[PDB]
C-alpha cells in the first residue's frame, strides 16, 4: 500500500512537471486519493484492493 | 443553559453537577437534566473512556 501511494504521488509530481492538461493531472490526483484511502481503510469504500 | 453541554446528550451526573455549579457561580443558567435508567449493557456501552 505504501509503495502504491508513493508511485501515485511521484507520477503526479512528474505530470505536473510535464505540464499535462488538467484532465490527466486530476485523474492521477483521483488515483492518489484512492491509494491513500486504500492505505488507511481498504474495504471501507466500495470494493477493496 | 449557559453550559457547553449538547442538548439530548448523555452526561455523567458528577460532571453535570460540577459544570452546573461552575456556571451558576459564574452567573450562567445551569443545564437542565433528566435522570435516565439504563440496563447494565447500555450502561457499559455508554462508557466515557
Amino acid at each position: 500500500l505504501y509503495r502504491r501511494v508513493i508511485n501515485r504521488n511521484n507520477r503526479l509530481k512528474r505530470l505536473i512537471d510535464l505540464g499535462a492538461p488538467e484532465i490527466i493531472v486530476n485523474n492521477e490526483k483521483r488515483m492518489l486519493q484512492e491509494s491513500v484511502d486504500a492505505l488507511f481503510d481498504n474495504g471501507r469504500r466500495g470494493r477493496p484492493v | 443553559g449557559s453550559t457547553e453541554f449538547l442538548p439530548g446528550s448523555l452526561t455523567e451526573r458528577a460532571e453535570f453537577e460540577a459544570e452546573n455549579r461552575r456556571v451558576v457561580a459564574e452567573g450562567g443558567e445551569p443545564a437542565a437534566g433528566r435522570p435516565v435508567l439504563m440496563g447494565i449493557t447500555k450502561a457499559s456501552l455508554a462508557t466515557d473512556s
Partner: protein
C-alpha cells in the same frame, strides 16, 4: 516517567505534527534490495531515515563499533546508534496534492458532510473529481455590478 502518565489524549494530527514526528521523507517506492538484501537508500526501509538494521554499524562503514554513539556519518547520514530505533522512528510522505482522510469522509455519519452540510453523495462526487463545488463568491462585486 510512568509516574506522570496520568491521562491519555487523542486528537486530529495536522501536517506540521506529521512533519515533526518524521525523521525523513520516503522518496522512492523501493523495498529491501533484491540484489543484496540491504535496505534501499530513500526506500521504505532506508537506514538514513529509520536507523541502522545492525547496532552501531555505519551504512558506509566509517563507524562500526559500540564505543561510538549518536554521531551522524558525514558521508551517508546514518546515525551510529542501537538498532532498536527502527521500531520507533517515524517517516512521512509529502503529497503533491491534498487528500481527505477516509475516516472523516466515509462512515455514517459523515463528519465532513455534517460539518459542511454536504450530502455524502455530493461530497463523494467532489472528492473523487466528478463534480465542481463553488468555494467562494465575491458577493458585493456581483451585487453592485
Amino acid at each position: 516517567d510512568v509516574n506522570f502518565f496520568d491521562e491519555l489524549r487523542i486528537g486530529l494530527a495536522t501536517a506540521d505534527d506529521i512533519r515533526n514526528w518524521s525523521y525523513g521523507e520516503v522518496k522512492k517506492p523501493e523495498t529491501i534490495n533484491y540484489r543484496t538484501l540491504k535496505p534501499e537508500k530513500d526506500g521504505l526501509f532506508c537506514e538514513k531515515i529509520f536507523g541502522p538494521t545492525r547496532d552501531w554499524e555505519c551504512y558506509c562503514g566509517k563507524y562500526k563499533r559500540v564505543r561510538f554513539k549518536g554521531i551522524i556519518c558525514e558521508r551517508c547520514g546514518v546515525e551510529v546508534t542501537r538498532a532498536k530505533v527502527r521500531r520507533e522512528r517515524m517517516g512521512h510522505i509529502e503529497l503533491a496534492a491534498p487528500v481527505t482522510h477516509i475516516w472523516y469522509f466515509k462512515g455514517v455519519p459523515s463528519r465532513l458532510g455534517y460539518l459542511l452540510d454536504l450530502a455524502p453523495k455530493d461530497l463523494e462526487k467532489i472528492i473523487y473529481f466528478a463534480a465542481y463545488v463553488i468555494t467562494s463568491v465575491d458577493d458585493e462585486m456581483r451585487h453592485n455590478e
